[PDB]
From a paper:
The axial structure consists of three morphologically distinct regions, the rod, the hook, and the filament from the proximal to the distal end, with a few minor components. The function of the hook is a universal joint that transmits motor torque to the filament in any orientation relative to the motor axis. The rod is a drive shaft that penetrates the peptidoglycan (PG) layer and the outer membrane and connects the hook with the rotor of the motor. The distal rod and hook show distinct mechanical properties, although they share the same helical symmetry and repeat distance and are composed of similar subunit proteins (FlgG and FlgE) with 39% sequence identity.
Here, we have constructed an atomic model of the St-rod structure on the basis of the crystal structure of a core fragment of St-FlgG (FlgG20) solved at 2.0 Å resolution in combination with the previous cryoEM map. The crystal asymmetric unit contains two FlgG20 molecules, mol A (80–224) and mol B (72–227), whose structures are almost identical to each other with a root-mean-square deviation (rmsd) of 0.60 Å for Cα atoms. The N-terminal 33 and C-terminal 3 residues of mol A and 25 residues of mol B were not traced because of poor electron density. FlgG20 shows a single domain structure composed of 15 β-strands and the loops connecting the β-strands, and is similar to the D1 domain of FlgE except for the absence of the triangular loop and the conformation of the N- and C-terminal regions. FlgG20 more closely resembles Cj-FlgE than the core fragment of St-FlgE. The β-stretch composed of the N- and C- terminal chains of FlgG20 (N85–T89 and Y218–T221, respectively) fits nicely on the corresponding regions of Cj-FlgE. Although the homology model is similar to the D1 core of the FlgG20 crystal structure, the crystal structure includes a part of the region connecting D0 and D1 that was not present in the homology model. The C-terminal region of FlgG20 comes close to the N-terminal end of the C-terminal D0 helix of FlgG in the previous rod model. The N-terminal region of FlgG20 goes into the edge of the elongated density that was not assigned in the previous model.
Residue numbers in the entry: 80 to 224
Write the structure that this text describes.
């Protein structure tokens, strides 16, 4: 496995902590894939869900421009609320990617990591299944691991 950090509650909807194994998958500015535990989410200039570093989550998730709030469930379901509408509208699925050897991941800076020969191939799964951890919106993973 890898070293889990302690989950502190911030109540910020942008913060999504991972409880257990897995990394968020993002697309680097050059088109390649990277991975991170930094669940600090955002909406880029075209409604795409991105991380704190500004990197688009992979696969792409589009947030409607009229979305009032974004909810990310423990299973990774991404939904939004819209004015006067009672039911939440699901807009995407946030996946968690696991590796055989997290130590083998290469740091590329900004809390991002990429797949290496030592890390093994990525295993993309739903949060909660196949060893992948769970997502806790409003929580941060503290670096005091």
């Amino acid at each position: 496995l890898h070293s889990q950090g302690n989950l502190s509650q911030t109540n910020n909807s942008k913060d999504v902590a991972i409880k257990g194994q897995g990394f968020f998958q993002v697309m680097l500015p050059d088109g390649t894939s990277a991975y991170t535990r930094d669940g600090s989410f955002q909406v880029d200039q075209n409604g795409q869900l991105v991380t704190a570093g500004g990197f688009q989550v992979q696969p792409a998730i589009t947030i409607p421009a009229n979305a009032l709030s974004i909810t990310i469930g423990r299973d990774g379901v991404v939904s939004v609320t819209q004015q006067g509408q009672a039911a939440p509208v699901q807009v995407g699925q946030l996946n968690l990617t696991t590796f055989m050897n997290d130590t083998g991941l290469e740091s590329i800076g900004e809390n991002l990591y990429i797949e290496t020969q030592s890390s093994g191939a990525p295993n993309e799964s739903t949060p909660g299944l196949n060893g992948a951890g769970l997502l806790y919106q409003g929580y941060v993973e503290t670096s005091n691991v």
